[PDB]
Symmetry: C3
């Protein structure tokens, strides 16, 4: 009989337990931890944790179902290489944002900084949105982002420019943009008599001149509908220009009204920071207060290695000013990509370890935004994974993932070029006790590493808390080879199964849920990406505007009435010029031509026709113009060249010519 | 330890229990009800119900998981404002129908009366089908429907016309259509010698003249394939006109054959009822017998208020004949939108309460289809929700949803303009006991109210029973703002996340299931809406006909051979006229032009060309016609105006003119 | 509604089926038909789960018996048609790269036959032998489903190989020898090379010659003065299913064959394929063994099961484990002896046999061997058809039962076999045929997978408005694929299970662009009739200088429909500019016959320049230049008019 104390070997007791248990009946471990010399059939346990040393001296923990209140979700399913949520996730006004990079490789080729969002606490996720376009100088360089967050109602992001060839950092820019909001306000709008401007009082609006603002029911004439910020007075007040003026002062004190902001309608503010000295990557984001934030960084190109943060004390007035702070030099070797968060006046920082044979991930806290630090190192050379985290009560809750199976432990070699099932872990650390000696890494889910290339999209995620749940957004692969070694060295995502990397989210309960469940089974046709409705005629209909940028082959085509009170069908051609041409036919090239007709059929009885004959046609490059009237308006009918071509011929005579004078013969 | 008697305060015992048990342990309540002064961590309980007074003196009940044997499903996911299944759901020949309205707001703007269907007892749902088009007089008026059902194999619906400006009723029409069926029959067709009609015996066929009927293996010559109903003899007999005749009488007695009906291929029968006096909304549907049905209604625009039903005793012969029957006068104030159902000679009616500070939902039963009533009032002013229901055994099983969190209780004010989690309830009422004093509203699922606008799409649903399961189809939102106050006051569904309201279905066990589970996890690529197949050369191929009505941007386009034994590629343009034009270039505006070519390339060596130059071109509005022959057929070559334009010019001379006679001057 | 009950993994005898969903971890034994006990599992009694794996408008059925696992990927091949027949049929598959949790967009493996619609393809036998897919591709008539031709099609499977050495290149010549053990490649097959360390052996190449089973040569575009050898150096290859052609071996109309069905890999050289003959008497059931499919794909030997087991039998499933070939038949009729099981240690020359009790019929019994047990799956095609003597029950909707059973091969006795009903499907009932069942079985790791058909309640309207059986009208055809995933050994890892919460974005990959508009970057083919609204053709071609539309066929046609409201306005305006106003650009307007100005053409530009040819009337001495009310001002000529 098992003791469940986390020290006594219960392997034998649990083996007998399973043998006495009906085939496919579950053993309840009662929330206890059981020491084992081998992991048993974990699927036949509930409410059970195992402690096991795969490598002697390195105990790790393994959760059966129901031991933690949690669940894994798959959140993207796209042919791009979708990975690196690190470390960009945030929650804004009830919506969970999972930003990432969708590329074709571990590099910036075909890369768009992207996000998916959840509007239902993680149950379902949105169609991916591209946040960046391809760099103007693609394919020499392209964008990259591992640091993104919100400060005073604006999205802030460190948008890097990196080379395709080498992934070398060339530029850093701070990009920011107001977040979309709906506000229900009382008073705060004033408009002086006999002039057109109105002043809008909105505390911490976070808007700049030119940003979008929408007004409804303002009760101040002219302050209405889609508008823009004309001036900024201070952080709580701005003005707008109205189209009109009144002979009396206007004020809406005590009246309820609506505003009115937009991410989509407002431009990015882009602040070029140039080539920042001694930076390899900017990574992670911690909002400090109403004026600024910190971003993590490391330098791992030359000795000595740097790990720390950039603090932007006033990102609104001074986006180009930041303060570089480093962690103690003892912890900087063999470290990268710090995760940073700020709670109750304390800045916490956790490093990634570069290798399993050297001291790895370490934790740091600061009460002066990185000037001084208290530090500790995690045992057993934690490496290859970032450790995104949040603080809940006295605990830091951190998540990490090995990139391929059995790489987590100190001294464990990289195991690539073969399919495996990498373990994802979480751990708690009490901040009062400040001691990681006995930290317990709990394996809560396993991912797939594909093995077709050396690189892994598994892990390197990001963590957020919303209400009583914590969310770890991270990469995982599947068994579909990208055929980089094979027929797709070009890494085209749209061939075969594209790239196996996609995003996942582990949702874990971290406090009481005092409501009845919101959970549902998704049984709908997904109808947001390409919204389809069977029309009254039984034909699939897409009412959304769409862009098809890949090569298209179409069958029979009808252009419906669409434009100018639906009077006309319309096709517009872009570029410097448009070209409508005719392929060389397969079976009868001698028939190559296009018939243009003002009527419904190929018979010229249905309307006027012009037929352009191809060079392959029996009648090479012929043109036949066939109407019951040929009317040449606004210009002379001329030959292109001088004294080269004729009007008519001996076998094609015009009956006569109707003229206002004799011909001019020279 | 807790008593679980619904009367003893069990708060302290449950808190102690929760403290003493591991978080992954599901505390089993053994189906009992526990009185609490605050709701505990519900997620940690199984088979437990709580009774709690959020508002003193108003106890409500709260289900942990596995207390009711039910599950929530999401059943639509489209950008439209998808709400108001009220009260239209029905089951027909093994298929569950969930009709609704997909609009852009609480109103008729952009509205299509729609449905989704389930062919697997609610596990998965189909691509939305539009049942109505936009009204001929859109955007002044559009359709609206809250009453729909089936009577003798025909769909019947009250199709309303309402103004976009005010949502005011302008017209009521009864629309009906035969439902699609396949019948596998033996005998029943006769055809008299020397004439062409055949008589088809199908009891209660429900077809009218002109309705679609398909025949297979009839063994009666000429009764074959797609046909239509020629005459209707009576409710059990109709004729078809065949294309042929025989010399002896035909009768397929004893022979197996197939029919034959189609919703899609049959027209609506539309009966104009004008503007029915004293009606605000027609809502809910109760099939009475083989001949007719009732539809609920209320009048709430002027005083005094009316609530009742319209009975259509013989909708087949007399669709214009309806009988107005009100509920008792004292239950009409502050009431609307009655749900009606008919079971074993009893008509049941349940009202919606208009406000929480006045007597609300009431229940009524009648043994004479609404001529006389027995009535009861639900305690505590039930308001803002319809209460759709079914009868199973001795119990009415009713479902309701508050529109926003904490609105259910009597005296509870509306709580809008902030995100919340509205409670959905069900309750049983024993019809023998006929007393609602002790009714128990059980919170079984929570929805989301978004809060970006005052209106809520939550709830207002519909209920059906299929086999041993009850289904509540209803609205729910998510956290995605429609940006009505923001960049989308126009409420375009296809911008951003469109509208958050979508449909859900709660599926609850109400009787024994004598089969092994049909349950599956859905792991397929949804491939009905836009059916895609990777063809043998690895390109995504869509074989379905489609309509793309939204603005379309295309890249490189190839129009394949498609028409007249695939001899030609074809584009047809609709409207009064077609327009093919050229945008102003943004790189080189002075190059603006389109090249039309009878060959494969831009070089005129490949085929005859006509190039139309834009006004922005350096050669403003030039036309170059370039072929090896220019042949003008069927008409004179003329200038558009008289004595204004010339043939040739001083630097563009024709060599000569070949004429049958001298020029005619002037 | 009864409170839920834990049955503690026990089996209970009952005279009526109980409220099954009331129970957890319980099995019931019940004799629906007296003397024929069957077993019924409540939730959680079996460690297993059902998945829906296709959802397309085609009639998706007949995984039988083609499923296989290759290098971590589970393949579920099937036929997507419009009926029980070869009309509109493509041999297709879906795949899982996550141990059955999620499945891929359907891929068509075959096109329509060159002689469609007289004949089309059909396949019930597919598998892998030495890194090549092998399939028996049948040609059958649309009219009668009659077999006209059998062909063996084979193709190398896509692989990525991470190797060390094996590439040698002799000096002064270009051919390089590549050493890949059991490569299974032929001349012309695709090979990709990376980091070879041998000059010229690089990128996309093809096999030039095959020396033996372990060595082949490639032709490089260069040569070196010294010998080359990458022994001790790491490099990459390099194979492709899609970029290599099929090898097609015509076997003609194989005599006495109705269907080829099922696939058993024997060794590194060959395999067996099951068959039956059931159109003429006497019936045949057995296998075809291809001992050397690589050198001699046309060489096969016919092996029948014992004669007493051939009547009333079809569609054998065959598998090969540890020197023994196992075969299980499908029964034709419930009133005659049905499914039987056979084993052979000499590839079907001699057999040991047994009969399953109670006339098992209408189902194939695909299976695998796990330890001492055969684990087999079957499905009745409609509800209550399974039992001996049970009549077919079609033309009404029902819930057919799916079963599995174990059979210990040491005991070799099926008398006490326990068929366990693990899941129920839907049979729609709109037509007599059923897509339910007829599946395929694979094992991957500690899980067994049964891939099979099931329908839903949506009528195809064959009897109704869709006798043409067009999949793209209404809900198309109800048959789609499912997969039951059952645990068959310990799982010593933490769970990989997830809830799928993503937008499915493989079939039609959509991304909201930076302008907020849905964007599809994948190349696509739309073959169904398209109706389009406002269309903009974007710059795409020749360093994006131009927008481009190319028209195929013998000729292209751009025309104008007869207008509904104003037919007197029928025309198309072609414009070099942005708007309908001629101020924006040169215009040519072609008027329809319905227009007030019937078949008028107006050419409107600030220059009309006729290049490369005379301006001529089509006919001789019939039409004029100008008219009495449309005079040209003059004619500028190099010489006086030539007048008749
Ligand atoms: C949609 C459509 O048909 N647009 C055509 C318009 C259309 O008739 C509008 O109602 C405006 O007229 O007309 C265009 O053509 C004019 C002749 O109708 C245009 O050619 C002008 O016609 C003269 O008015 C005239 O005397 O009738 C005057 C100008 O010399 C002449 N201008 C030019 C540039 O030719 C139009 O663009 O307005 C053509 C268009 O397809
Ligand atoms: Na991917
Ligand atoms: Na919606
Ligand atoms: Na199907």
């Amino acid at each position: 009989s098992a003791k469940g104390d986390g020290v006594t070997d219960d392997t034998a007791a649990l083996t007998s337990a399973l043998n006495d248990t009906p085939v496919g009946q579950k053993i309840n471990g009662n929330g206890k931890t059981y020491k084992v010399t081998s992991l048993p059939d974990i699927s036949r346990f509930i409410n059970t944790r195992f402690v096991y040393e795969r490598i002697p001296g390195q105990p790790l923990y393994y959760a059966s179902e129901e031991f933690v209140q949690g669940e894994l979700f798959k959140i993207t399913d796209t042919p791009y290489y979708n990975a690196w949520p690190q470390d960009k996730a945030f929650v804004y006004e009830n919506v969970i944002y999972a930003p990432y990079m969708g590329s074709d490789r571990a590099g910036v080729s075909r890369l768009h900084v992207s996000w998916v969002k959840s509007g239902d606490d993680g149950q379902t996720w949105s169609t991916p949105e591209w946040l960046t376009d391809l760099h103007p100088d693609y394919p020499t360089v392209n964008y990259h982002c591992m640091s993104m967050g919100v400060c005073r109602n604006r999205l802030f992001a460190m948008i890097e420019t990196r080379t395709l060839a080498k992934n070398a950092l060339t530029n850093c820019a701070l990009w920011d943009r107001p977040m979309s909001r709906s506000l229900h306000l009382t008073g705060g709008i004033t408009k002086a008599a006999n002039q057109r401007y109105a002043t809008i009082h909105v505390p911490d609006h976070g808007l700049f001149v030119g940003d979008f603002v929408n007004f409804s029911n303002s009760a101040v004439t002219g302050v209405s509908g889609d508008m823009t910020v004309a001036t900024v007075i201070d952080k709580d007040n701005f003005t707008v220009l109205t189209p009109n003026q009144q002979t009396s002062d206007l004020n809406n004190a005590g009246k309820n009204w609506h505003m009115g902001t937009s991410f989509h309608k407002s431009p990015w503010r882009k602040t070029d920071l140039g080539l920042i000295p001694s930076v390899t990557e900017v990574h992670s984001f911690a909002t400090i207060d109403n004026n600024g934030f910190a971003m993590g960084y490391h330098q791992g190109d030359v000795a000595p290695r740097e790990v720390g943060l950039f603090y932007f004390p006033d990102a609104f007035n001074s986006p180009s000013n930041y303060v570089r702070r480093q962690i103690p030099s003892e912890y900087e070797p063999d470290a990268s990509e710090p995760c940073i968060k700020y709670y109750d006046g304390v800045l916490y920082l956790i490093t990634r370890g570069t290798r399993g044979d050297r001291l790895g991930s370490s934790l740091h806290r600061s009460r002066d935004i990185g000037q001084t630090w208290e530090s500790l190192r995690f045992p057993h050379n934690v490496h290859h994974t970032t450790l995104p985290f949040a603080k809940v009560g006295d605990d830091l809750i951190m998540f990490g993932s090995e990139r391929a199976e059995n790489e987590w432990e100190a001294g464990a070699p990289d195991d690539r070029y073969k399919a495996s099932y990498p373990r994802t872990f979480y751990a708690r650390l009490n901040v009062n006790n400040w001691n990681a000696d006995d930290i317990e890494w709990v394996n809560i889910t396993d991912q797939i590493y594909q093995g077709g290339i050396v690189n892994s999209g598994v892990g390197v995620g990001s963590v957020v808390v919303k209400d009583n749940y914590i969310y770890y957004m991270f990469g995982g692969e599947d068994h579909f080879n990208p055929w980089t070694y094979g027929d797709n060295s070009a890494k085209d995502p749209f061939k075969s199964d594209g790239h196996p990397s996609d995003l996942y989210c582990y949702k874990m309960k971290i406090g009481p849920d005092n409501r009845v469940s919101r959970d549902f089974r998704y049984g709908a046709v997904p109808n947001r990406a390409v919204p389809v409705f069977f029309d009254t005629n039984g034909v699939r209909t897409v009412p959304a505007p769409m862009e098809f940028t890949g090569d298209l082959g179409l069958g029979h085509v009808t252009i419906r009435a669409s434009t100018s009170s639906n009077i006309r069908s319309e096709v517009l051609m872009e570029g410097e010029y448009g070209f409508i041409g005719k392929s060389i036919p397969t079976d009868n090239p001698a028939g190559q031509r296009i018939i243009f007709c003002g009527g419904e059929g190929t018979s010229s009885t249905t309307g006027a026709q012009i037929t352009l004959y191809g060079a392959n046609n029996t009648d090479s490059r012929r043109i036949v113009y066939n109407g019951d009237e040929h009317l040449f308006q606004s210009a002379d009918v001329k030959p292109y060249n001088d004294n080269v071509t004729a009007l008519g011929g001996p076998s094609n005579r015009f009956t006569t010519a109707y003229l206002g004078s004799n011909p001019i013969v020279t």
